[PDB]
Design a binder for this molecule. Structure first.
Ligand SMILES: *[C@@H]1O[C@H](CO)[C@@H](O)[C@H](O)[C@H]1NC(C)=O
Ligand SMILES: *[C@@H]1O[C@H](CO)[C@@H](O)[C@H](O)[C@H]1NC(C)=O
Lengths: 54, 98, 49, 262, 104
């Protein structure tokens, strides 16, 4: 599994902390986490996970 | 083909911000002074003349480089291979690669 | 050279060195406009093509 | 597939960027053309604009464009959305900032749209060449012939690795946030959005406020105010200001990557 | 920009016979070989930015009816300076040039 960083928290990339929706809860925090993980080899998984909101 | 990536210019209102060489292909940074930027809100920076804009630009591969591109090759020498058909007597064609 | 062939040369299709000689010069923005004008030699790849 | 990439573009907002030809003159336009890519065959081009396509301020629906009427982020139904180089082009697709269109050879590229009475148009020069594939220089793609390999822009994501760099908007300037009140000037934060004021009453006054704050001073043109919204992304455009410590990138997907087709 | 009683810069006036009828500017398209950008319209005159072409067509809509007129004046694009550009650039050098004024 690939690891990604949000501030000092470190988490599996495919499963960000919020899960149901990570742009409505805190839009700034999701963006800043996507910016902090720019160079990650598994950034695509994060971008799907963050944008996922049913 | 190349793509000139042009990042967003840095506009300092009452300051002089200066270039810092970055490890980038054909990287160019210039610090043009005396800029009074106008934008949809209208008056972007206060100071009439003591304004600075730092513009930077650097060349990348175009998006199409993965589809069309020229591969430069050094050739020296190689195998010579051939497909051969043989018949002999009542045996039919065999057609094997050598 | 700047515009004949090999103006942009990369060792592989995913390399990061990306030697590129295009004579890129940044130009002064026009009065009022926040834009980043620049001048460059047209690609030698297309000239070759 | 289509849904997830359109969902994915919801982090990106349109922006107003300087454009050379707006019709009358040169102005800041919601439909500013950032880049035209015209190195595919058979006259298919990809225009990156400053307006979102297929997005609604709340959701995705592939009949809606979104664009800034100031700081309003208003969304409309695609009224005309026309692309023309020398004769009108055929809008093959529109996704995010990008539109993919089949165009005749020309010396300009103009993209424009209608918001009720108002017409927003932007022309850049960008000479467009029709690129025949093969050993006959035909001007329009034939109805029969031979299938040869050629470079075309996809409309479906192939397994993306082509990315567009995005950043948080810097200090969007607006003077409608300044007003005259009593005898001083008033900075009104529209809603939950910070504002940086730089007020040269003769002492240099400045600060960042999350609420209304009278800033003394006398005239409105001493008190330059900048909207700080960090809730959306904008393309890392050369026509948008940035600040000193604004390095953080955003890395969104690009639709309509090049592909080899026949 | 005229109304049968007054001025208002959204209205054209033209004769439908002997009637001298006034309408809102519906399209007012000007086209040489591609549509032109109507910089202004004042009195009998309209000022437009046009691509190079071999005809000049002006037309307008009065509801269902379309009134159009094409003349065979050839319009040449005239670069200013020592480079033959076909469309005005976004950057470059500000050089003196001849333009039609837009108010007076
Ligand atoms: C650092 O991690 C600890 C442990 O999870 C947490 O309690 C703390 O809030 C984190 N600090 C920051 C600044 O995120
Ligand atoms: C020779 O071999 C080829 C296959 O390589 C086969 O198709 C052909 O029938 C053979 N020659 C003759 C005369 O049949």
């Amino acid at each position: 599994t690939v690891m990604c960083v949000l501030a000092n928290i470190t988490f599996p990339c495919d499963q960000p902390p919020c899960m149901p929706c990570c742009y409505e809860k805190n839009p700034h925090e999701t963006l800043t986490m996507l910016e902090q993980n720019y160079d990650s080899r598994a950034y695509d998984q994060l971008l799907d996970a963050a944008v996922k909101c049913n | 083909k190349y793509k000139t990536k042009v990042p967003s210019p840095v506009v300092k209102c009452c300051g002089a911000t200066q270039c810092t060489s970055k490890p980038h292909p054909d990287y160019q940074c210039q610090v043009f002074s005396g800029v009074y930027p106008f934008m949809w809100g209208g008056a972007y920076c206060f100071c009439d003349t003591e304004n600075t804009q730092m513009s930077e630009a650097y060349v990348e591969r175009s998006e199409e480089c993965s589809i069309d591109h020229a591969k430069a090759y050094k050739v020296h020498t190689g195998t010579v291979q051939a497909m051969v058909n043989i018949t002999y007597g009542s045996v039919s064609w065999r057609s094997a690669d050598v | 050279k700047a515009g004949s062939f090999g103006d942009l040369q990369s060792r592989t299709s995913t390399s990061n060195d990306l030697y590129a000689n295009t004579n890129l010069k940044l130009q002064r923005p026009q009065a009022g406009i926040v834009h980043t004008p620049f001048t460059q030699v047209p690609s030698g790849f297309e000239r070759w093509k | 597939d289509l849904d997830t990439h359109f969902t994915q573009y919801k982090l990106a907002r349109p922006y107003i960027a300087d454009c050379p030809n707006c019709g009358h003159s040169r102005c800041d336009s919601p439909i500013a053309i950032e880049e035209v890519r015209g190195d595919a065959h058979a006259g298919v081009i990809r225009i990156q604009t400053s307006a979102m396509f297929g997005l609604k301020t709340d959701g995705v629906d592939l009949a809606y464009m979104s664009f800034m009427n100031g700081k309003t982020q208003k969304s409309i139904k695609i009224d005309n959305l026309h692309v023309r180089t020398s004769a009108p082009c055929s809008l093959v697709s529109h996704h995010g900032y990008y539109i993919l269109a089949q165009c005749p050879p020309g010396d300009t590229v103009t993209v424009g749209f209608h918001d009720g009475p108002n017409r927003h148009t932007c022309t850049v020069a960008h000479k467009v060449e029709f690129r025949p594939v093969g050993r006959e220089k035909y001007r329009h793609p034939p109805e029969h012939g031979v299938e040869l390999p050629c470079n075309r822009y996809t409309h479906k994501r192939a397994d993306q690795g082509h990315y567009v760099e995005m950043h948080q908007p810097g200090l969007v300037a607006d003077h409608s946030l300044l007003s005259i009140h009593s005898a001083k000037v008033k900075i009104t934060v529209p809603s939950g959005a910070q504002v940086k004021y730089y007020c040269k009453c003769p002492d240099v006054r400045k600060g960042i406020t999350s609420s209304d704050h009278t800033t003394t001073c006398t005239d409105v043109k001493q008190c330059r105010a900048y909207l700080i919204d960090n809730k959306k992304w904008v393309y890392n455009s050369g026509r948008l200001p940035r600040g000193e410590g604004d390095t953080f990138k955003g890395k969104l997907h690009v639709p309509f990557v090049p592909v080899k087709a026949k």
